[PDB]
Amino acid sequence: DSFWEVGNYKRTVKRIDDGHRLCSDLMNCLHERARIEKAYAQQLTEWARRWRQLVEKGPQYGTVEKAWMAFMSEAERVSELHLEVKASLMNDDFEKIKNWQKEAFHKQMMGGFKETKEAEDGFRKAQKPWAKKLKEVEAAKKAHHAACKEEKLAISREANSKADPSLNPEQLKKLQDKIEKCKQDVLKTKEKYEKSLKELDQGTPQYMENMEQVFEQCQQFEEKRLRFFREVLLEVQKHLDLSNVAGYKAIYHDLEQSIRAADAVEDLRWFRANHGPGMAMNWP
Amino acid sequence: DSFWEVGNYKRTVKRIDDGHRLCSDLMNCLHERARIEKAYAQQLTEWARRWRQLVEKGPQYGTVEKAWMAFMSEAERVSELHLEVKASLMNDDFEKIKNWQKEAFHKQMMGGFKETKEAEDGFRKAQKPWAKKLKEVEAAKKAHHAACKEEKLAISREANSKADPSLNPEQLKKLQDKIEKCKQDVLKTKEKYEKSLKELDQGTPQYMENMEQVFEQCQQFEEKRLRFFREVLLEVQKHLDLSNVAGYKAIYHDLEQSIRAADAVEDLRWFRANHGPGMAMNWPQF
Numbered sequence: 354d355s356f357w358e359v360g361n362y363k364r365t366v367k368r369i370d371d372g373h374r375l376c377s378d379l380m381n382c383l384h385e386r387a388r389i390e391k392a393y394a395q396q397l398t399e400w401a402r403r404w405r406q407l408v409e410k411g412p413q414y415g416t417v418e419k420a421w422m423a424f425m426s427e428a429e430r431v432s433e434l435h436l437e438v439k440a441s442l443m444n445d446d447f448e449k450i451k452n453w454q455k456e457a458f459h460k461q462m463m464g465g466f467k468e469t470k471e472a473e474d475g476f477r478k479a480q481k482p483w484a485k486k487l488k489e490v491e492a493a494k495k496a497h498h499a500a501c502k503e504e505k506l507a508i509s510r511e512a513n514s515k516a517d518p519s520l521n522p523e524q525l526k527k528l529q530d531k532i533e534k535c536k537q538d539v540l541k542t543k544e545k546y547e548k549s550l551k552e553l554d555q556g557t558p559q560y561m562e563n564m565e566q567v568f569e570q571c572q573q574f575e576e577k578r579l580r581f582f583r584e585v586l587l588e589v590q591k592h593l594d595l596s597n598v599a600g601y602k603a604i605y606h607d608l609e610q611s612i613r614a615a616d617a618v619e620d621l622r623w624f625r626a627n628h629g630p631g632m633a634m635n636w637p
Numbered sequence: 638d639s640f641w642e643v644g645n646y647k648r649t650v651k652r653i654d655d656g657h658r659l660c661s662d663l664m665n666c667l668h669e670r671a672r673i674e675k676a677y678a679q680q681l682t683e684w685a686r687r688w689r690q691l692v693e694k695g696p697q698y699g700t701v702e703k704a705w706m707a708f709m710s711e712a713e714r715v716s717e718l719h720l721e722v723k724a725s726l727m728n729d730d731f732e733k734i735k736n737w738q739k740e741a742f743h744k745q746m747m748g749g750f751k752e753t754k755e756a757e758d759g760f761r762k763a764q765k766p767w768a769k770k771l772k773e774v775e776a777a778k779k780a781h782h783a784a785c786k787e788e789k790l791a792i793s794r795e796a797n798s799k800a801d802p803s804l805n806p807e808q809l810k811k812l813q814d815k816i817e818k819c820k821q822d823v824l825k826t827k828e829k830y831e832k833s834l835k836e837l838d839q840g841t842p843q844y845m846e847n848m849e850q851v852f853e854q855c856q857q858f859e860e861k862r863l864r865f866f867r868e869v870l871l872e873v874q875k876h877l878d879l880s881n882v883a884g885y886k887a888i889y890h891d892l893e894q895s896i897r898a899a900d901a902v903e904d905l906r907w908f909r910a911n912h913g914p915g916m917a918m919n920w921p922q923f
């Protein structure tokens with residue numbers, strides 16, 4: 354139930370297998386994000402190339418045709434931005450974790466992680482002396498718990514056979530022979546059965562110190578990882594961050610200007626000269 | 638090829654049908670943009686849900702578990718903003734163009750549009766006066782070229798008949814008059830050809846005046862469409878713009894602070910107390 358109970362250091366021992374687990378999960382978490390960002394960028398440039406072409410082949414010409422293209426252009430600037438969001442998540446963040454994992458966890462041959470294995474052995478050693486004494490102590494209490502269960506059997510047995518009618522010449526003595534024999538046990542077994550509980554307590558302050566020394570080490574190894582995680586997530590939020598960006602705002606004040614540059618009357622002047630009454634005519 | 642040659646005004650008339658198409662094209666262009674916005678927003682939320690589950694059912698607990706989770710949140714917050722872009726494009730800009738195209742163009746029962754048909758007729762009535770005249774000159778150029786063609790024929794024929802001897806005496810008077818009428822036609826048809834040439838130049842000034850009045854009418858209609866596109870495009874640029882949004886900065890406002898709220902020392906202190914030496918023990922007794 355508790356850490357100090359034999360073999361319960363395991364909960365923290367498992368805590369490092371998970372460390373390697375979570376590194377991979379964090380890596381995939383980000384990996385899927387990058388993938389999502391890339392798709393939005395693929396869809397962006399396709400829509401842009403699709404419609405840049407459709408507008409150019411279409412009937413729209415002149416200055417309004419331009420404002421419209423500025424539109425596809427923004428789909429392309431926005432595409433390049435999310436393309437870099439992805440590039441950053443994979444080239445910087447993802448890799449940073451992949452490399453930390455390789456430096457913090459070393460897959461063994463048999464085999465698990467050289468690190469989890471070392472925590473196991475360190476705990477096992479700390480407990481070893483204490484578990485053996487418990488091994489002795491548990492024999493102490495259980496043997497006597499059968500020794501006391503063995504005084505009561507004859508005390509309530511004798512008065513029971515005392516009321517009995519027959520055979521009291523020598524059969525009397527044996528009745529008084531096997532209740533007092535159990536008397537030497539309850540004193541002899543208990544005497545040592547509670548002596549082991551002594552030795553255990555002498556060899557207890559060390560066991561507690563040899564288990565906090567292994568533990569604080571496991572803690573130190575987790576602390577490094579936790580700090581890493583917080584540090585990396587900080588850099589990730591910065592790579593996803595598009596709320597306050599220079600290049601981003603340029604995309605949109607450029608767009609606005611380009612559309613504002615659209616001159617309806619200018620475009621009309623052009624159509625009059627090149628397809629209308631402005632055209633030259635060879636009069637008979 | 639020039640606009641002034643008959644039936645060439647059709648280029649500007651064709652412009653009216655094209656205006657209607659372009660309204661449809663812009664409509665479709667924006668729709669596919671809005672659908673892209675939706676797909677991205679959607680992916681972002683499929684993702685957020687998937688990983689909120691995985692981190693919660695996973696081994697990671699404490700403040701770091703949270704910093705990691707405020708992360709699925711930012712994906713959900715970004716997602717919503719792009720659904721806003723999608724919404725604005727379809728509810729405002731798409732509907733806007735859709736309605737304008739319904740009050741600018743009316744579909745005749747027979748075909749085409751009321752405005753396309755209206756302009757074409759306007760160009761015919763403006764041209765008919767001059768069209769009938771060019772038709773007359775068009776013949777004069779031919780009949781005269783036929784008279785000059787037939788003329789050099791008769792002369793060549795008497796000249797080709799200059800060396801060739803009899804027969805005959807009566808055959809000549811025939812080949813003698815053939816030429817006279819020919820030298821007559823070139824002086825006659827030339828007269829009619831000259832007459833129509835000037836007969837047109839007196840009906841030509843009134844031809845351009847009417848052609849212009851119909852043209853400005855088409856410009857008047859094209860101007861509204863062109864000015865409208867400018868208007869709508871500015872409204873889309875505004876809707877597409879996420880580079881300066883309060884609700885957007887706020888996302889990383891809270892992400893950064895939810896991440897910085899992470900604390901290794903605290904998480905470890907919780908673990909030892911709840912899973913380690915901090916735990917009290919049922920120390921053995923008699």
Ligand SMILES: [Ca+2]
Nearest residue numbers: 408409411413
């Ligand atoms: Ca074009």
Ligand SMILES: [Ca+2]
Nearest residue numbers: 692693695697
């Ligand atoms: Ca969890």
